Amino acid sequence: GLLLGDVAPNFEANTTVGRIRFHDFLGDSWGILFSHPRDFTPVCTTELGRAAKLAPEFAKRNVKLIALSIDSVEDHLAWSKDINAYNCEEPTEKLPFPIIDDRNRELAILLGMLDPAEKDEKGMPVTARVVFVFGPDKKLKLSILYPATTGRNFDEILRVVISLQLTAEKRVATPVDWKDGDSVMVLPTIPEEEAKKLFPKGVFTKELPSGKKYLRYTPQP
Amino acid sequence: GLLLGDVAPNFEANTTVGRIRFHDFLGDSWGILFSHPRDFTPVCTTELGRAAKLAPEFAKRNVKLIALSIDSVEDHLAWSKDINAYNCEEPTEKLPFPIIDDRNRELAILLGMLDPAEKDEKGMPVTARVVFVFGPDKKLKLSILYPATTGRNFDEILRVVISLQLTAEKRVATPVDWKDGDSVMVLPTIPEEEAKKLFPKGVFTKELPSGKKYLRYTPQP
């Protein structure tokens, strides 16, 4: 389907906000293209529920959310009412991000999104719970591929956006389980001399059995 | 590289514990094959260390771990002493799971683990932080694709593993940000009659604008 560094295909599809071209929609912002099996289903409701609640948190960082399903734009709007309702807001047919129409599976097939078990009422497969994170350069920066049985972690989605943006801006990398604000690791390539000069906040090396000096933390720049 | 449902290639790999055929290593347990860009580097070390600290929680649930990079099995052995040190354990070259040697980028290109922004001294590119989850039947149940810069979240890996196993034995499905133990969603195509019989702990349905009966909560079966 898709792999790291690949450019986003500049597709055209109908969405709850009209037909559009992907790159045009994305413009000059990071983008999160995520998929969900089917409208009018429980997990997908909690997911898009959560995603709408988190939208300002994403917009503030110049990230554009856009969903996608094998349902119709009609279906989308009808379900948005259910969405706005689920999370206790006014039941319009509007959301803080478009939902993409993909009944004919053009995008599903191409992007490699198809759930192996899940099917509509005609036995035709639907998408899984996919996330693509696109940099402003239109290149894939991170992706996630979850089954329809297992809802995603949206906090984690937010976390990694934050890390992708930091590590784009600063010559560091975030360790396992990193939380926003925590220490980060100094890139293994940057020599001791340039590291002090590059991280005034402090540069702490952990001494190892191999006596190599790679294991180096520094406060979030 | 790999889509949901696809069968794990029964490859041969040289690891820190010997040569193996993949399926035989798995036997009939769930498998987590995961890649990191390079030995003797800071994020990777944090990752495998954390992995090694979790290995009991995965094993008590019939999940085998198997790590992998481009580094030599000679490297892997040395760096395990650092992994172990980092964990504050006796710095042997022993780890609760093996590490594949992909010197040749053979499984890397196979499973599509190649990273876009990271290479070794010799020019050749390396793997990014990918995780494949395989069921006892050797099928991709879940996968994630993180870049060199962004450490993974291993508590989320364990979480989706819990979910994958739950939803495979019970006809439910976990919502966004479901914590192990939290209540789960009733599968939407289960009839109320059959559902009341399936979930004695109770089924709880939130009326919505659409009047549809799909948003049904039940305590974890």
Side-chain angles (χ1 to χ4, degrees):
Chain A
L2 200 43
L3 60 72
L4 243 33
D6 296 342
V7 175
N10 196 4
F11 68 91
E12 146 235 288
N14 222 101
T15 91
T16 56
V17 300
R19 214 89 186 175
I20 200 140
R21 284 310 184 287
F22 199 29
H23 298 201
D24 295 17
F25 165 81
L26 281 186
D28 276 333
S29 8
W30 298 76
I32 299 178
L33 205 225
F34 68 115
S35 76
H36 65 275
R38 205 69 176 289
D39 309 5
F40 301 107
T41 49
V43 182
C44 305
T45 297
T46 65
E47 291 196 292
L48 269 83
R50 230 324 212 196
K53 296 302 205 186
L54 285 175
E57 216 59 67
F58 281 107
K60 172 173 37 177
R61 281 135 168 130
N62 199 18
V63 179
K64 291 169 166 67
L65 256 17
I66 183 165
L68 185 150
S69 185
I70 58 76
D71 296 278
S72 44
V73 18
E74 272 200 341
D75 271 322
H76 293 348
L77 304 180
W79 181 50
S80 295
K81 297 144 93 70
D82 285 357
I83 309 264
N84 293 312
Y86 152 84
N87 63 13
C88 296
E89 310 199 355
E90 185 167 311
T92 81
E93 37 196 78
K94 301 190 70 187
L95 288 181
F97 54 80
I99 304 177
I100 286 171
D101 183 316
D102 201 50
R103 303 112 77 201
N104 78 314
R105 275 72 160 170
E106 233 177 304
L107 292 165
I109 277 286
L110 172 68
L111 296 171
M113 296 188 171
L114 285 185
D115 191 277
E118 271 275 311
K119 293 159 183 78
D120 56 32
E121 65 290 338
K122 300 142 172 43
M124 308 185 36
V126 308
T127 63
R129 288 167 204 290
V130 179
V131 183
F132 290 116
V133 181
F134 288 107
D137 53 23
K138 308 283 164 310
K139 299 195 188 87
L140 178 58
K141 258 70 187 101
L142 185 147
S143 76
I144 294 166
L145 212 180
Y146 279 26
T149 57
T150 296
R152 285 158 285 192
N153 175 334
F154 260 85
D155 290 349
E156 172 64 23
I157 295 170
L158 211 210
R159 177 182 92 77
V160 312
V161 157
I162 291 184
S163 160
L164 295 176
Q165 291 182 347
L166 177 58
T167 66
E169 177 74 26
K170 300 245 46 200
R171 305 178 60 206
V172 302
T174 57
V176 64
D177 303 341
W178 180 81
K179 290 175 276 71
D180 193 5
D182 299 1
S183 324
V184 294
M185 309 319 283
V186 171
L187 292 179
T189 71
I190 150 177
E192 287 91 355
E193 157 83 76
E194 186 187 21
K196 336 162 298 191
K197 222 284 166 294
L198 199 43
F199 312 96
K201 285 68 66 269
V203 166
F204 313 98
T205 308
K206 151 62 91 284
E207 244 53 64
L208 297 161
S210 67
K212 309 197 168 210
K213 293 180 182 304
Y214 59 91
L215 196 48
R216 300 188 290 176
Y217 314 76
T218 173
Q220 187 176 287
Chain B
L2 219 46
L3 307 182
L4 276 185
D6 289 356
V7 181
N10 194 4
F11 62 79
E12 281 86 73
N14 200 23
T15 86
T16 73
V17 303
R19 298 214 157 80
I20 55 127
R21 224 107 150 267
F22 197 45
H23 294 208
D24 313 337
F25 172 68
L26 270 336
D28 53 35
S29 35
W30 293 77
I32 297 170
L33 177 257
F34 67 107
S35 81
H36 61 273
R38 202 74 196 276
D39 301 3
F40 305 114
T41 58
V43 177
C44 301
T45 314
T46 79
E47 256 155 8
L48 274 73
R50 181 53 179 182
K53 287 262 170 184
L54 292 179
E57 296 286 354
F58 284 108
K60 76 150 64 179
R61 295 175 169 97
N62 197 39
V63 175
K64 312 200 166 319
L65 304 162
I66 200 180
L68 179 159
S69 68
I70 321 297
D71 291 305
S72 76
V73 21
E74 292 227 85
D75 290 322
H76 300 349
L77 288 172
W79 181 53
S80 313
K81 304 170 168 163
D82 295 0
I83 307 307
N84 285 296
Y86 171 90
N87 278 338
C88 306
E89 305 182 295
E90 205 207 327
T92 86
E93 51 206 42
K94 103 224 205 59
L95 249 46
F97 56 79
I99 315 167
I100 297 157
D101 169 326
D102 204 14
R103 282 156 118 114
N104 268 284
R105 272 78 176 188
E106 276 300 283
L107 298 74
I109 273 282
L110 215 223
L111 308 177
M113 321 186 284
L114 51 123
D115 181 281
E118 279 232 1
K119 302 125 204 58
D120 64 353
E121 191 198 331
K122 237 286 221 167
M124 296 121 72
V126 301
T127 62
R129 304 186 201 272
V130 55
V131 179
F132 299 116
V133 190
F134 298 111
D137 44 86
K138 314 284 172 304
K139 301 205 196 182
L140 196 60
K141 311 303 206 183
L142 190 136
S143 72
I144 106 176
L145 217 212
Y146 283 24
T149 59
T150 307
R152 282 156 289 206
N153 168 357
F154 265 74
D155 296 43
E156 166 73 358
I157 283 153
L158 181 70
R159 184 194 72 88
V160 300
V161 159
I162 297 295
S163 171
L164 290 167
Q165 300 199 329
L166 169 86
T167 61
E169 281 187 10
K170 295 294 173 188
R171 317 184 47 210
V172 287
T174 64
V176 262
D177 305 343
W178 174 84
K179 291 166 196 300
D180 167 34
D182 293 347
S183 47
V184 287
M185 304 321 261
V186 170
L187 291 179
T189 62
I190 295 180
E192 173 224 329
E193 170 214 89
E194 184 173 10
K196 91 231 302 182
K197 308 304 286 270
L198 245 41
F199 312 112
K201 289 147 269 64
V203 185
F204 301 85
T205 130
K206 167 172 193 43
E207 301 294 315
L208 291 139
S210 165
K212 285 166 193 300
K213 301 310 163 125
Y214 64 86
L215 189 65
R216 314 181 276 172
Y217 289 100
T218 174
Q220 189 179 246

